[PDB]
Write a protein that binds this DNA or RNA. Structure first.
Ligand code: DGT
Ligand code: MN
Ligand code: MN
Length: 174
DNA sequence: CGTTCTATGTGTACTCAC
DNA sequence: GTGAGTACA
DNA sequence: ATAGAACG
């Protein structure tokens, strides 16, 4: 059980204090690559976890980022962890809260921000409407017949447009 | 023929068996 | 190592 | 979004 007001605050603590351990060397993830997503990006009044998105700049780093995740000074358990999804139950001023971390390559930034803000039913109703047209939309790309179709694309709003859906700010998405 | 309702996707990390 | 089958998005 | 079905 978690409300937006400190959900905002928890993410503020972390914007500066996420890092991983790359073959002995700690490396800090900088906020120009931390994105809030999920119900927090959609400004839901009440949350039941925080979903952060971590953008790694080169592929060779994916294997090491999340399995070796380190947040400065706060205890947490990993329930699950791989190289593109990890889940952490963290201690917030004597409160236990669920933290889901994901990772996207730069090449995936909009596709991944889209997919990971949601809401769920939004996603089910766009991945459907695009399959009809012999496409498939997932976390990583827009694919027609197992080949990525190139889109001169950078942010979310251009992707939502260039595939043919009305763009609504996170809060008003469904 | 219009109004209303309904349904619809996809991938990751995990776990036991052969 | 593969991989069906599951928890959980 | 969109299309198929029940409804009138
Ligand atoms: N819940 C859910 N999320 C999914 C699913 N598939 C993809 N997603 C994406 C969209 C969600 O924004 C994101 C996971 O978000 P969460 O499951 O934590 O819920 P959300 O953040 O949207 O609201 P919440 O965390 O429940 O307060 O993953 C799915 O099948 N179920
Ligand atoms: Mn969430
Ligand atoms: Mn989550």
């Amino acid at each position: 059980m978690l409300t937006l007001i400190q959900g905002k605050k928890i993410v503020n603590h972390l914007r500066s204090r996420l890092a991983f351990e790359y073959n002995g060397q700690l490396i800090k993830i900088l906020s120009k690559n931390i994105v809030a997503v999920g119900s927090l990006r959609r400004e839901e009044k009440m949350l039941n976890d925080v979903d952060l998105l971590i953008i790694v700049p080169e592929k060779k780093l994916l294997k090491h980022v999340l399995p070796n995740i380190r947040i400065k000074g706060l205890s947490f358990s990993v329930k699950v962890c791989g190289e593109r999804k990890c889940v952490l139950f963290i201690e917030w001023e004597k409160k236990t809260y669920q933290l889901d971390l994901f990772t996207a390559l730069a090449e995936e930034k909009p596709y991944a921000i889209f997919f990971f803000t949601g809401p769920v039913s939004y996603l089910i109703r766009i991945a459907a409407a695009l399959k009809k047209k012999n496409y498939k939309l997932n976390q990583y790309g827009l694919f027609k017949n197992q080949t990525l179709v190139p889109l001169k694309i950078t942010t979310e709003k251009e992707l939502i447009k260039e595939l043919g859906f009305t763009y609504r700010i996170p809060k008003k998405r469904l």
